[PDB]
Design a protein around this ligand. Sequence first.
Ligand SMILES: [Zn+2]
Ligand SMILES: [Zn+2]
Lengths: 114, 48
Amino acid sequence: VGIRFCQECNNMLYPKEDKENRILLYACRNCDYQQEADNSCIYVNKITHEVDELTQIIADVSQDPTLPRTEDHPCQKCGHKEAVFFQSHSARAEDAMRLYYVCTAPHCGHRWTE
Amino acid sequence: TVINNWLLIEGHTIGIGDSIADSKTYQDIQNTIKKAKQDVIEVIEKAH
Ligand SMILES: [Zn+2]
Ligand SMILES: [Zn+2]
């Protein structure tokens, strides 16, 4: 999945085949540094990719003066009443109007979606 | 010619009295507008 780098030349490690022990080795093209990986999966491609933005929503959006606010949706963690909300705010989304919420209490930053 | 010289008797105009409605009509229009805005709000709530 991710990119792993050689410790000698600090270049990308390409996958190379070990035709003796039937094992996967990551080797670079600059030096002869070898490795054994734990992912065991070279490549992964998901075409749905309906990523939940709760990973990508920052908790600092609560300081936006231009966002709507509601008090009928208390925070799950700290029980604070006021909570900002907004829409998906994502391009390349075929169809979405679901709301997202962020707690406005400082240092809480709870970001959920009912 | 005939209609113009007769129109010199009847006359024609356009004014605010011709562009103003009645109180009952104003109430009807405002009611309809409020109902439509409420329905739009309901649709938005269902979408959310
Ligand atoms: Zn290397
Ligand atoms: Zn909270």
